């Protein structure tokens, strides 16, 4: 929001922007150390080992 005298308010004194997660619901760890992962399911009628 600005005014014609020059006074203005931006998106830094009303909010704090930061790079963060898209969703915070799921997170994981491996032997105590925090680690993400991806779980693969197999398509129907496909072979496993190949």
């Amino acid at each position: 929001k600005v005014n014609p005298d020059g006074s203005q308010v931006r998106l830094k004194d009303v909010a704090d922007v930061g790079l963060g997660g898209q969703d915070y619901s799921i997170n994981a760890q491996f032997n105590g150390s925090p680690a993400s992962g991806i779980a693969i399911k197999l398509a129907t009628g496909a072979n496993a080992l190949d």
Partner: protein, 53 residues
Amino acid sequence: NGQANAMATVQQLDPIYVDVTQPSTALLRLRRELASGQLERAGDNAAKVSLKL
């Protein structure tokens, strides 16, 4: 007599006032830094610097 709208206008162009704006948050942050934080004071050399069109 005493109408609101004017008929003409005269003005002086030497010198010229320029008024800028400043949010109060930066002013209080400069006040809290100027005395207890990073102590700094320039002096009369910090009267004024230039502007940009």
